[PDB]
Amino acid sequence: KIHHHHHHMVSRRISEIPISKTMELDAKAKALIKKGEDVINLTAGEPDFPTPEPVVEEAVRFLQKGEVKYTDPRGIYELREGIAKRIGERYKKDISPDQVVVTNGAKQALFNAFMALLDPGDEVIVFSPVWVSYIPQIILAGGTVNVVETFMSKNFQPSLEEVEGLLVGKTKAVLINSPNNPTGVVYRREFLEGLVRLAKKRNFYIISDEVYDSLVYTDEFTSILDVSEGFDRIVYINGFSKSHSMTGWRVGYLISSEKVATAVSKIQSHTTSCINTVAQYAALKALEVDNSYMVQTFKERKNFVVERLKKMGVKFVEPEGAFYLFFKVRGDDVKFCERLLEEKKVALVPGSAFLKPGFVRLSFATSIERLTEALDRIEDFLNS
Amino acid sequence: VSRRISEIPISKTMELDAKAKALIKKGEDVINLTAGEPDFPTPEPVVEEAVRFLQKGEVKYTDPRGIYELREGIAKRIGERYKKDISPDQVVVTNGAKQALFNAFMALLDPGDEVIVFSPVWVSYIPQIILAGGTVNVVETFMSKNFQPSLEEVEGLLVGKTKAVLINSPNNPTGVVYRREFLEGLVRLAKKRNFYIISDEVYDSLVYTDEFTSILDVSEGFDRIVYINGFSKSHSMTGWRVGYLISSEKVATAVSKIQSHTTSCINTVAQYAALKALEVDNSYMVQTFKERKNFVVERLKKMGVKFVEPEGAFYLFFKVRGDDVKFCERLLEEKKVALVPGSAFLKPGFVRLSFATSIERLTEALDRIEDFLNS
Ligand SMILES: *Cc1c(COP(=O)(O)O)cnc(C)c1O
Ligand SMILES: *Cc1c(COP(=O)(O)O)cnc(C)c1O
């Protein structure tokens, strides 16, 4: 007899996606929990608030009619119009509903942008410390990435000067995320105005991920929509996940030119089609809902963690938004987090995950009570 | 704007959709037989479970592959139906079967790889394959052969960069089911020449015959098989956007990566809804569709219309003389009945009628179609 053997190959691009530095640490935290350990988990990327009750009530009312059917792939007109009107009023712009595409979280708005704008080999400039999903998405879309590192000594502010220096012919977009995950910084108005100038001159799109724009602890937040006129070179990304603690609903959106929105809408349509109809109605109600209580709760947690860490001699840039604090650790950050987890049962995220080694990310989407206990344990750990 | 978006074939149906709405605005009584979704509500036990989940207020991120209990439920039902041992880690929950398909192409195709598809072909497959960087090779099937593909023709298109053959049975737009002997032959060819069979079985519940065979009836294991299904058609849950992919653990892991970085996890409410939907019987809806199928076949057959009797799904794909886009445009304008041109599925000279409507409305639409054909 004669034996033959077959390979079972997946696409090379899957390999090209960076490995998780984080999947083992989450499994470690969960395993400590399952054997009766008191793990304080400060790694969350989502608010610890429920969906606002008015949103629940509207979703239930819609649901009880029993009709959950396909919609326009770009989102129901009323949701697009509501989004267009809210963002338009906030930033004194005339946004048409046809400039908006409703997507499965801001995450799919981002992916759709890259797929809509990037030809194979096109380059996107990103700024580290950088959120974990951007690079995977750009890779999946056929693009390449130029990571521009920022520094704690510069308050993690990108250098406009240095950005122009890196522009090449293939540079199709510059991605900004303010307020920033994982640092919590908010980009300066002067930088953004300049970037908008660079985009007109040097012919590239600005993709702006502003999902944390409500969770601001300061009056210095500047949106790309504060410094732009029109959307010719702007892709604006937001959604309901952070602002309304609706992460599991998966509702976000993109606003750009009608041209880009149309392209993005084609991606949306052929990939997932329309998003969950219940979610669309939930989001439409969410537009009417005030999140002031949540934002103030996060502001006071931010103030508490900031004061506490300063006192312990820990080094960091004071976050002005989102719900992260990115602080400096001695040695290897992965090992820092492994040991703190195993010894103190506090879970943090290695800065390595965000391409900035020697740092750790703490989330303060938990009670002051739990934060106090965690910060206690961290202080003990820092003084062996 | 990326080149691939321009590579996407232009819609044949955009003007027609807009004309149907315009006619409605003008108070015209349009009978719209274009639907790709059942006309049933979400089953009430499903609604009740979704409501029960919702009222606790916690709608948060889950495992990007889908909650374990959902993956476990799906693995168990499919495994029990087809006498297979399926692990929950073989399953990825996705935003409809549509996203499972996209994720499969993204997970499997490198730039330039080929995928073979059969026309008449559902409108989203080719856009997806192009977005994923692939090229399409279309094998045409014929009414006189009950739209059953030639295995010889498939084989004659194979290259080293052929990564997949895509099958859709029961079929949209024809309603045919692929015979077992073809599927067995395909599985042999997939081993001989090293490609994946991607099987879109979303209509497998809506079958009016004993002759439906799944790719899982003819394959052993999942090393070359990508199985796609969901709740949209079986449970009339289209707007929930819940589907899934089952494959090898290696494929499912790659697909999980794509899901994770693109949309992440699906709507949490939808996941609990789908979990409950696994326990729900859809027999009443299937029997309703069967009776509608028998009625439309009988009526079209009597009026001398040529078509193959659908064996599944809720479409009938019949012959027309001339330009099928113009047929549909004129039928809509003159008789206020909406059909989809066969051209949209790469099969000119046909039109697609959907029977996701009541017999009363089907009766009236058919009267109008009979008049139109008899001038
Ligand atoms: C949470 C988050 C998002 C959006 O997530 P969705 O839940 O998909 O809306 C986008 N960017 C950053 C940096 C985030 O942290
Ligand atoms: C409706 C349909 C699907 C599934 O759509 P989802 O709503 O995304 O699950 C898949 N394939 C065909 C051929 C269809 O008609």
Please tell me whether residue B220 adopts helix, strand or coil conformation: coil
CA distance B325 to B340: 8
Q: Closest Cα partner for A324 from A126, A116, A183, A175?
A: A183
β-partners of residue A361 are A326, A349
A168 Cα: distance to centroid of ligand 2 (angstroms): 42
* Radius of gyration, alpha carbons of chain A: 22
Distances (CA, A) of B280 to A52, B44, B92, B273: 30, 9, 21, 11
Provide the greatest CA pair distance for chain B. Answer: 60
Sort residue A245 into left (φ over 0), alpha (ψ -120 to 50) or beta. left
Contact A276 B270 (CB under 8 A): yes
SS3 B48: helix
Element (H, E) at B243: strand B243-246
- Give chain B's end-to-end CA distance (angstroms, integer): 47
- CB-neighbour burial class of residue A279 (10 A; exposed 0-12, middle 13-18, buried 19+): buried
Taking the C-alpha atoms of residue B125 and residue A272, their distance in angstroms, rounded to an integer, is 12
d(CA A113, CA A109): 6
CB distance A101 to ligand 1 below 6 Å? no
Q: Are B132 and B101 in contact (CB under 8 A)?
A: no
CB A131 within 8 A of CB A278: no
Specify whether the CB–CB gap between B136 and B112 falls below 8 A: no
CA distance B35 to A60: 26
Enter the DSSP assignment of B128.
H
| Dihedral, CA of residue B230, residue B233, residue B235 and residue B236, to nearest 10 | 130
C-alpha count within 13 angstroms, C-beta hemisphere, residue B289: 29
Residue (of A123, A161, A155) closest to A142 by Cα position: A123
Structure tokens at B157: 């298109």
H or E stretch at B92: strand B91-94
Q: Which helix (H) or strand (E) holds B135?
A: strand B135-140
What's the sign of the alpha-carbon dihedral B216, B221, B225, B228? positive
Task: Give CA angle at B365 (B362, B371), nearest 5°.
Answer: 140
Nearest CA in chain A to B9: A266
Q: CB-hemisphere CA count at 13 Å for A247?
A: 18
Least Cα separation, residue B43 to chain A (angstroms):
7
What is the Cα–Cα distance from A324 to A182, expressed in whole angstroms?
Answer: 6
For A313, the token pair is 């001699």
What is the per-residue DSSP string for B321-359? SS-HHHHHHHHHHHH-EE-EEGGGGT-TTEEEEE--S-H
Determination technique for this entry: X-ray
Q: Are A351 and A182 a contacting pair, CB within 8 Å?
A: yes
Indicate left, alpha or beta for B242 from its phi (over 0: left) and psi (-120 to 50: alpha). Answer: beta
Distance CA A353, CA A132 (A): 7
- Tell which phi-psi region holds residue A248, choosing left (phi > 0), alpha (psi between -120 and 50) or beta: alpha
- Whose CA is closest to A184, among A21, A301, A19, A20? A301
Nearest CA in chain A to B55: A56
- β-strand partners of B243: B94, B230
Chain A residues lying within 8 Å of B36, measured CB to CB: 70
Partner residue opposite A272 with nearest CB, options B44, B98, B254? B98
Ligand nearest to the CA of A274: 2
Pairwise CA distance, residues B98 & B58, whole Å: 27
Q: Please report the resolution in angstroms.
A: 1.9
The kind and range of the H/E element at B254 are helix B249-262
Instruction: Take residue A306 and report the two structure tokens written for it.
Output: 């900031």
CA distance A283 to A268: 18
Residue B213, classified by CB atoms within 10 Å of its CB into exposed (0-12), middle (13-18) or buried (19+), is middle
CA-wise closest residue to A14 among B131, B245, B133, B254 = B254
- Direct distance between the N- and C-terminal alpha carbons of chain A, in angstroms, rounded to an integer: 66
Cβ contact, residue pair B262, A137, below 8 Å? yes
Q: B60-280 is classed in which CATH architecture?
A: 3-Layer(aba) Sandwich (3.40)
C-alpha span between B74 and B201 (Å, rounded): 14
Please tell me the distance in Å from B108's CA to the nearest CA on chain A: 5
Structure tokens at A350: 């290695």
Half-sphere exposure of B131 (CA within 13 A, CB side): 32
Judge: domain B1-59+281-372, CATH 3.90.1150.10.
yes
The residues facing B5 across adjacent strands are none
CB contact under 8 A, B131 and A115: yes
Kindly report the length of chain B: 375
How far apart are alpha carbons B63 and A288 in whole angstroms?
30
Cα(A79)–Cα(A62) distance, integer angstroms: 14
Choose from B129, B262, B271 for mutation: most chain A CBs within 10 A. B262
- Give A251 Cα–ligand 1 centroid separation in angstroms: 10
Looking at residue B5, the DSSP 8-state letter turns out to be: H
Contact A137 B194 (CB under 8 A): no
Q: What is the DSSP string of B267-324?
A: -HHHHHHHHHHTT---HHHHHHHHHHHHHHHHHHHHTT---PPPSBSSEEEEE-SS-H
| Residue A203 identity (one-letter amino acid) | N
Question: B142 with B307: CB under 8 angstroms?
Answer: no
> Are the beta carbons of A256 and A99 closer than 8 angstroms?
yes
Strand pairing partners for A43? none
Contact criterion met (CB < 8 Å) for A266 and B109:
no
Closest approach of A247 to chain B, Cα-based (Å): 5
3 state SS for chain A: CCCCCCCCCCCHHHHCCCCCCCHHHHHHHHHHHHCCCCCEECCCCCCCCCCCHHHHHHHHHHHHCCCCCCCCCCCCHHHHHHHHHHHHHHHCCCCCHHHEEEECHHHHHHHHHHHHHCCCCCEEEEEECCCCCHHHHHHHCCCEEEEEECCHHHCCCCCHHHHHHHCCCCEEEEEECCCCCCCCCCCCHHHHHHHHHHHHHHCCEEEEECCCCCCECCCCCCCHHHHCCCCCCEEEEEECCCCCCCHHHCCEEEECCHHHHHHHHHHHHHHCCCCCHHHHHHHHHHCCCCCHHHHHHHHHHHHHHHHHHHHCCCCECCCCECCEEEEECCCCHHHHHHHHHHHHCEECEEHHHHCCCCEEEEECCCCHHHHHHHHHHHHHHHCC
Alpha-carbon gap, residue B81 to B234, rounded angstroms? 15
Residue B276: which of B238, B242, B227, B313 has the closest Cα?
Answer: B242
Q: Residue B164, CB half-sphere, CA atoms under 13 Å: how many?
A: 34
Separation of alpha carbons A236 and A256, rounded Å: 6
Sign of CA dihedral B43, B49, B52, B57: negative
Distance CA B312, CA B207 (A): 4
Pairing of strands A234-239, A252-255: antiparallel
Letter for the amino acid at B165? V
What are B322's two structure tokens? 């001339």
B268 vs A contacts (CB less than 8 Å): 248-249
With 0-12 / 13-18 / 19 or more C-beta atoms within 10 angstroms meaning exposed / middle / buried, residue B344 is: buried
Which numeric CATH code is attached to A69-289?
Answer: 3.40.640.10
CB of A192 closer than 6 A to ligand 1? no
Q: Is A237 exposed, middle or buried (0-12, 13-18, 19+ CB in 10 A)?
A: buried
Secondary-structure class of domain A7-68+290-381 per CATH? alpha beta
Q: How far apart are CA A132 and CA A17, in angstroms?
A: 11
Angle between helices A258-271 and B96-108 (to 10 degrees): 90
Cα of A92 to ligand 1 centre, how many Å? 25
Distances, alpha carbon B47 to alpha carbons A65, A250, B43, B60, B237, in Å: 9, 19, 7, 19, 10
In a 10 Å sphere around its CB, with 0-12 CB exposed, 13-18 middle and 19+ buried, how is residue B258 labelled? buried
Write out the two tokens for A97.
Answer: 């509903």
From CA A115, how far away is CA B15, in angstroms rounded? Answer: 26
CA B256, B262, B263, B264 torsion: positive or negative? positive
Contact residues for A355 (Cβ-Cβ < 8 A; gap 6+): A128, A129, A130, A147, A149
* Cα A284 from chain centre: 21
Which pair of tokens denotes residue A368? 């002051």
Closest ligand to the CA of A177: 1
A181 carries a ligand binding annotation: yes
Phi, psi of B223 (to 5 degrees): -60, -35
Work out the number of other CB atoms within 10 angstroms of the CB of residue B156: 9
Task: Name the token pair of A150.
Answer: 């920022």
d(CA A127, CA B291): 60
Two tokens at A72? 């326009």
Ligand 2 environment, Cβ below 6 A:
A 273; B 36, 96-98, 122, 168, 172, 200, 202, 230, 232-233, 238, 243
Taking the C-alpha atoms of residue A186 and residue A177, their distance in angstroms, rounded to an integer, is 8
List the beta bridge partners of residue B338: B32
**Radius of gyration over alpha carbons of chain B, in Å?**
21
A vs B, Cβ pairs < 8 A, gives 194
The Cα B115–Cα B103 span in angstroms is 14
Nearest CA among B217, B273, B209 for reference residue B59? B273
In terms of DSSP bridges, do strands B162-168 and B135-140 run parallel, antiparallel, or are they unpaired? unpaired
- d(CA A196, nearest CA chain B) in Å: 19
User: How far apart are the C-alpha atoms of B140 and B57, rounded to whole Å?
Assistant: 51
Question: Strand B135-140 and strand A324-328: pairing?
Answer: unpaired
With H, G, I as helix, E, B as strand and everything else as coil, classify residue B176: coil
Report the DSSP pairing between strands B243-246 and B91-94: antiparallel
> B238: how many CB neighbours lie within 10 A of its CB?
24
Cβ–Cβ below 8 Å for B267 and A249? yes
C-beta of residue A251 within 8 angstroms of C-beta of residue A104 = yes
Contact in structure between A205 and A173 (CB atoms under 8 Å): yes
How far is the C-alpha of A375 from the C-alpha of A377, rounded, in Å?
5
Domain boundaries, chain A: 7-68+290-381, 69-289
Helix (H, G, I), strand (E, B) or coil at B101: helix
Q: Of the candidates A216, A222, A226, which has an alpha carbon nearest to the alpha carbon of residue A320?
A: A216
Cα distance between residue A86 and residue A95, in whole Å? 9
Q: Considering only CA atoms, which of B61, B255, B260 is closest in space to residue A108?
A: B260
Contact (Cβ atoms closer than 8 angstroms) between residue B353 and residue B337: no
SS3 B72: helix
